Amino acid sequence: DWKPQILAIICNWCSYAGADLAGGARIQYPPTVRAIRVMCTGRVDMLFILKAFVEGADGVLVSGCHFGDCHYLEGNYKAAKRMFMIKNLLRNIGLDDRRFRMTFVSASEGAKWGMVMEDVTNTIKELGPSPIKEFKK
Amino acid sequence: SYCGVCVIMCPFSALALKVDGEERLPILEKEGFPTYDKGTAIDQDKCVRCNICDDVCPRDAIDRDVPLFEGEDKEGLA
Amino acid sequence: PRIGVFVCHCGTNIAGSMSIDDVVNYAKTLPYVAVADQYQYMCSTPGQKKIDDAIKEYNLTGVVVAACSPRLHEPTFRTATKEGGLNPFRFEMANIREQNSWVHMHGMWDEATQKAKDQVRMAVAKAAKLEDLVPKSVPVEKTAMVVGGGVAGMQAALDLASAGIKTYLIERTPTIGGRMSQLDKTFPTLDCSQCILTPKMVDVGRHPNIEMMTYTEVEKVEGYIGNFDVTLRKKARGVLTPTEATAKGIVGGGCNGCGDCSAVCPVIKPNPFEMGMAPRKAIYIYHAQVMPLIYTVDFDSCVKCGLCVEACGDKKAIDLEMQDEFITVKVGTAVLATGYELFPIENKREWGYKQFDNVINALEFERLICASGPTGGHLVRPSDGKTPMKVGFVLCAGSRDNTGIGKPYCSRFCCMYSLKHAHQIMEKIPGAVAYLFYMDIRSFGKMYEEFYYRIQHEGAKFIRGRVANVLEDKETKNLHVFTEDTLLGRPVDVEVDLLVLAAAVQPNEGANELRKKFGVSASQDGWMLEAHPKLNPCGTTTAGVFLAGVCQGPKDIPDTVAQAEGAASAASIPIHMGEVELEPYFAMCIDELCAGCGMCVNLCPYSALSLGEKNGRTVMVVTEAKCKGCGTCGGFCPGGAIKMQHFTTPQIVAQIDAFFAG
Amino acid sequence: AKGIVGGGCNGCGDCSAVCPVIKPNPFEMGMAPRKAIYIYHAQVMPLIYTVDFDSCVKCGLCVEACGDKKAIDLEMQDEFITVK
Numbered sequence: 001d002w003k004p005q006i007l008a009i010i011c012n013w014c015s016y017a018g019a020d021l022a023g024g025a026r027i028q029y030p031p032t033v034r035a036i037r038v039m040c041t042g043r044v045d046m047l048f049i050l051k052a053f054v055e056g057a058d059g060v061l062v063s064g065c066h067f068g069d070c071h072y073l074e075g076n077y078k079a080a081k082r083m084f085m086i087k088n089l090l091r092n093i094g095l096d097d098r099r100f101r102m103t104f105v106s107a108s109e110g111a112k113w114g115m116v117m118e119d120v121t122n123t124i125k126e127l128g129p130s131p132i133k134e135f136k137k
Numbered sequence: 138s139y140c141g142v143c144v145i146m147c148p149f150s151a152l153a154l155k156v157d158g159e160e161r162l163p164i165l166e167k168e169g170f171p172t173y174d175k176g177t178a179i180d181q182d183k184c185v186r187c188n189i190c191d192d193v194c195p196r197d198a199i200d201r202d203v204p205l206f207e208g209e210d211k212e213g214l215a
Numbered sequence: 216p217r218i219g220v221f222v223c224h225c226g227t228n229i230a231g232s233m234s235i236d237d238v239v240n241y242a243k244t245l246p247y248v249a250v251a252d253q254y255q256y257m258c259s260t261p262g263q264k265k266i267d268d269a270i271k272e273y274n275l276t277g278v279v280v281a282a283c284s285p286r287l288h289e290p291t292f293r294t295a296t297k298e299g300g301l302n303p304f305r306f307e308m309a310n311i312r313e314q315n316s317w318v319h320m321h322g323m324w325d326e327a328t329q330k331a332k333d334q335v336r337m338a339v340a341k342a343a344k345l346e347d348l349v350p351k352s353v354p355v356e357k358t359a360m361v362v363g364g365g366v367a368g369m370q371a372a373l374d375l376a377s378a379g380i381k382t383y384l385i386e387r388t389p390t391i392g393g394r395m396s397q398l399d400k401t402f403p404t405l406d407c408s409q410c411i412l413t414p415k416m417v418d419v420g421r422h423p424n425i426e427m428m429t430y431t432e433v434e435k436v437e438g439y440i441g442n443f444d445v446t447l448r449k450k451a452r453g454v455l456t457p458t459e460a461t462a463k464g465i466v467g468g469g470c471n472g473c474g475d476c477s478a479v480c481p482v483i484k485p486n487p488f489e490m491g492m493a494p495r496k497a498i499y500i501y502h503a504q505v506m507p508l509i510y511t512v513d514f515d516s517c518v519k520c521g522l523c524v525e526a527c528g529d530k531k532a533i534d535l536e537m538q539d540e541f542i543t544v545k546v547g548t549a550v551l552a553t554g555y556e557l558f559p560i561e562n563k564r565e566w567g568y569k570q571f572d573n574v575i576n577a578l579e580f581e582r583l584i585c586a587s588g589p590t591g592g593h594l595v596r597p598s599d600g601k602t603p604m605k606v607g608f609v610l611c612a613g614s615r616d617n618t619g620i621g622k623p624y625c626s627r628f629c630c631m632y633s634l635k636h637a638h639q640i641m642e643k644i645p646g647a648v649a650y651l652f653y654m655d656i657r658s659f660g661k662m663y664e665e666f667y668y669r670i671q672h673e674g675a676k677f678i679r680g681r682v683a684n685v686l687e688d689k690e691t692k693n694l695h696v697f698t699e700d701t702l703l704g705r706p707v708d709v710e711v712d713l714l715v716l717a718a719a720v721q722p723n724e725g726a727n728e729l730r731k732k733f734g735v736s737a738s739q740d741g742w743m744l745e746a747h748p749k750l751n752p753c754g755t756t757t758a759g760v761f762l763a764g765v766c767q768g769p770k771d772i773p774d775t776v777a778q779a780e781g782a783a784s785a786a787s788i789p790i791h792m793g794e795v796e797l798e799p800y801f802a803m804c805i806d807e808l809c810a811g812c813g814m815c816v817n818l819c820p821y822s823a824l825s826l827g828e829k830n831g832r833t834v835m836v837v838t839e840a841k842c843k844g845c846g847t848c849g850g851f852c853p854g855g856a857i858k859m860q861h862f863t864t865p866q867i868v869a870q871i872d873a874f875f876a877g
Numbered sequence: 878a879k880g881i882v883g884g885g886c887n888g889c890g891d892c893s894a895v896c897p898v899i900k901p902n903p904f905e906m907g908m909a910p911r912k913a914i915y916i917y918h919a920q921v922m923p924l925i926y927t928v929d930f931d932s933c934v935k936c937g938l939c940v941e942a943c944g945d946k947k948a949i950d951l952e953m954q955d956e957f958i959t960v961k
């Protein structure tokens with residue numbers, strides 16, 4: 001009756017390329033994550049993550065370039081600081097902060113993208129349904 | 138070119154086209170070629186099971202499905 | 216809004232993983248969708264015709280194509296959307312092939328179908344909120360810059376100049392030419408390497424469209440495809456060219472290259488052109504065939520004795536108090552041609568490079584064998600100056616090595632140049648024998664295999680074994696090379712008079728600094744990265760910057776020149792047009808929502824944001840040319856006063872909302 | 878240009894669906910069949926369906942399949958053009 005709802009927000013220049021490379025190489029993984037594709041992860045506002053979690057994302061993933069490998073010289077440092085602060089907010093509002101993570105996937109790491117997909121799915125399955133969906137009523 | 142025109146236009150069918158393993162004529166399947174009107178027929182309300190037509194036939198193309206009576210064999214009926 | 220959804224089968228690549236019929240029916244029942252339809256190859260001419268007919272018939276506002284990746288087919292379907300009466304940017308893709316089919320092929324079909332329905336829903340939600348953009352066209356300055364004065368830089372500069380574009384040629388060293396100027400003879404044609412370069416050096420020095428700036432570096436670069444504001448450091452050469460002397464007022468001239476200055480200079484230092492084997496004064500030229508024959512002064516080693524100025528006399532070319540001058544130049548495109556250096560092979564201690572006298576590397580051997588080198592072209596042993604009679608060549612020295620000391624790649628030309636050096640010794644010293652300790656002879660180019668055949672015919676010994684270690688005889692200084700003859704099947708101990716290491720090559724010194732100034736990334740190997748490894752080996756991901764030569768990866772002089780001319784052509788494409796279109800992803804400030812806090816200003820790596828006066832209120836101002844569309848500022852601004860043109864917050868939030876719609 | 882308003886070849890494939898001649902495909906190094914009227918593969922840039930005149934038997938089924946598009950001219954000859 002329950003299937004995890006995981007949302008990914010992946011940059012165009014390394015994480016979308018890595019997911020595309022995994023697909024091209026035919027690396028299988030479970031069909032639980034759906035992606036959004038912004039240009040950089042610097043674009044990811046905090047309110048995007050919080051909006052996802054309040055609509056009912058059982059998990060949220062944000063994937064971007066490695067440090068020093070952003071297409072736009074430093075846009076993922078901003079995203080990293082923002083996601084550290086988001087981890088702190090979710091812990092202090094009492095939602096489980098491991099529902100959220102930020103992975104750094106390069107353009108050539110299709111295998112690592114597959115492993116990230118598998119691990120995110122496993123972690124959210126262990127965690128269970130998000131509590132917001134029943135706390136709203 | 139495996140068109141099969143030779144198979145359609147040979148008067149005594151001694152040429153056949155088999156595409157995969159079956160006698161198959163795509164040009165007829167698409168109706169791209171006329172065929173010969175030999176127009177054969179034997180009005181069975183006039184034929185009398187005679188034996189002349191099978192006897193005079195230069196090739197082997199007449200079937201006489203008649204029980205074989207005491208002539209040359211055991212009685213077809215009697 | 217009225218959206219059309221067109222679902223490609225990709226010729227069973229997608230229909231063999233999901234139910235395209237079900238996806239299409241779901242798209243039909245989706246809100247805002249006017250028409251939903253499918254085709255086998257939406258990237259083909261009937262597919263574009265299908266899109267255009269649907270647009271005309273159903274009066275479509277936007278188009279959603281459920282197909283392969285946007286990185287693969289945005290231009291195709293944007294042009295298909297334009298041809299049909301829409302804006303190109305009323306279009307959005309739903310990647311249901313490389314992120315649904317190819318990853319959910321096996322044993323899971325209704326799950327892939329549900330994922331496809333979700334992706335189509337999110338794409339439709341975004342496209343129902345996209346609106347019209349027009350790409351920005353920016354003018355292109357009609358100059359070009361070439362950093363590097365090697366063969367690849369000189370070829371690119373000559374190509375651009377003869378195409379008519381004014382070109383700057385920046386070289387850090389006092390002369391152009393590069394490594395090929397150090398080469399003695401060239402494989403496989405055995406032509407005098409320096410001689411072939413000399414006409415082309417003269418062409419570069421005489422071309423009116425080339426601004427040859429030797430002994431100069433690139434301090435900083437800012438700008439974009441349109442205008443690159445490049446600041447150059449004109450290092451204090453210490454000597455004036457005739458033009459500069461006349462400008463400063465000395466009628467008698469500047470430097471004519473007589474040599475009296477270096478005849479009287481008392482300082483003596485190693486010559487970097489001769490890899491240190493040869494002396495040169497404090498005021499010097501590398502070799503007698505340098506293109507600007509202008510006699511740099513080495514200020515780190517000059518003692519300001521003033522003898523040089525007395526020798527120069529009325530020419531008055533020497534200014535011992537000269538300082539680093541800075542110049543700012545505006546250019547349209549840039550070509551990077553930084554070349555390479557030899558990997559430090561003293562780290563491989565088993566081959567006693569620095570510790571045994573008679574172990575040298577291949578550029579030192581090339582200078583020793585050249586007739587213009589420290590010797591009279593006579594190869595002699597460094598230990599005692601005697602002529603060798605047995606010479607060993609250690610191929611793969613520091614290459615195809617996964618131990619962390621050497622390089623894991625092949626340096627491409629080291630098998631060929633070792634064959635050349637074996638030939639040169641066997642023909643220059645009568646009775647000398649060349650031993651090549653090899654592990655995969657790689658003679659792949661045109662006439663290379665024939666060159667290999669000819670060297671074996673002249674009688675070089677080929678021992679298939681990587682050298683294990685080298686011991687030096689204590690008295691004769693001879694070198695005992697220990698390896699196994701893998702084909703013979705026995706260990707060997709070959710005693711040679713001279714050992715030559717075919718060392719790996721690595722990016723030049725400072726190349727990473729320069730490519731970070733220009734915004735270029737690096738490869739796995741450490742060389743500069745190209746836009747697409749197959750179909751675009753010259754351009755980089757940053758627009759207006761192009762690669763040429765060994766700086767992108769090791770190559771022979773033929774391949775280097777082909778790459779250099781390719782880069783010159785790519786750099787000429789936007790200059791000849793004079794226009795270039797930027798992608799309309801810019802940030803646009805909504806002024807009557809900006810509060811003027813100024814906090815976003817420091818979040819732009821490109822300094823596109825600033826605080827300015829509009830209607831008395833202090834609001835933020837975007838230099839739309841400098842913006843690159845990253846979105847950092849617009850993801851920061853708390854009040855939502857920054858709009859990202861094709862990835863607006865309402866659009867992204869509509870995608871999120873559509874994902875959670877059930 | 879020749880006057881047929883309805884168009885020329887749109888790459889529908891009906892012609893090769895009805896052609897009865899079958900010959901090896903040089904694009905597939907001979908492993909695969911292709912009719913007398915054909916394209917090498919589905920991703921050819923001019924999707925215009927050449928006729929192989931060395932192997933066509935001029936049965937005329939292709940023109941009936943093409944219909945009002947009238948893209949097939951079985952009597953076409955080698956035209957010569959001079960370009961400077």
Ligand SMILES: Cc1cc2nc3c(=O)[nH]c(=O)nc-3n(C[C@H](O)[C@H](O)[C@H](O)COP(=O)(O)OP(=O)(O)OC[C@H]3O[C@@H](n4cnc5c(N)ncnc54)[C@H](O)[C@@H]3O)c2cc1C
Nearest residue numbers: 363365366367387393394401402554555764765770771772
């Ligand atoms: C021992 C040896 C023998 C060889 N023999 C042959 C042969 O026989 N035949 C053959 O075809 N190939 C041969 N090669 C390969 C050949 O040298 C290269 O293919 C060729 O030199 C590549 O030239 P390039 O212009 O790309 O680089 P380079 O020749 O290295 O030129 C780069 C230039 O850029 C300058 N530069 C570097 N960094 C900067 C900077 N930041 N700013 C400004 N200027 C900068 C350098 O000073 C240099 O002048 C040999 C190589 C070696 C090592």
Ligand code: SF4
Nearest residue numbers: 138139140141142143
């Ligand atoms: S007529 Fe018969 S032999 Fe001639 S091309 Fe057709 S099938 Fe072949």
Ligand code: SF4
Nearest residue numbers: 184185186187188190
């Ligand atoms: S000849 Fe043949 S068809 Fe005619 S009557 Fe006799 S059996 Fe019948």
Ligand code: SF4
Nearest residue numbers: 223225256257258283
């Ligand atoms: S658009 Fe993409 S999915 Fe569709 S046929 Fe072309 S390559 Fe295949």
Ligand code: SF4
Nearest residue numbers: 470471473474476527
């Ligand atoms: S003496 Fe003066 S003119 Fe002659 S080479 Fe030296 S600097 Fe140049």
Ligand code: SF4
Nearest residue numbers: 480517518520521523
């Ligand atoms: S000032 Fe003296 S040390 Fe310096 S270049 Fe002139 S002669 Fe040599």
Ligand code: SF4
Nearest residue numbers: 611614625626629630
């Ligand atoms: S080119 Fe030859 S010598 Fe150089 S690394 Fe490659 S295999 Fe070794």
Ligand code: SF4
Nearest residue numbers: 809810812813815852
């Ligand atoms: S756009 Fe936002 S961050 Fe920038 S000055 Fe205005 S209010 Fe401040």
Ligand code: SF4
Nearest residue numbers: 819842843845846848
């Ligand atoms: S999106 Fe914002 S931060 Fe990024 S380059 Fe443009 S103005 Fe600067």
Ligand code: SF4
Nearest residue numbers: 886887889890892943
């Ligand atoms: S020739 Fe006619 S039938 Fe054949 S593909 Fe072209 S338009 Fe269709």
Ligand code: SF4
Nearest residue numbers: 896933934936937939
């Ligand atoms: S005319 Fe030629 S191409 Fe057309 S159906 Fe007949 S054999 Fe095939």
Ligand code: FES
Nearest residue numbers: 011040064065071
């Ligand atoms: S381009 Fe991917 S994180 Fe910036």
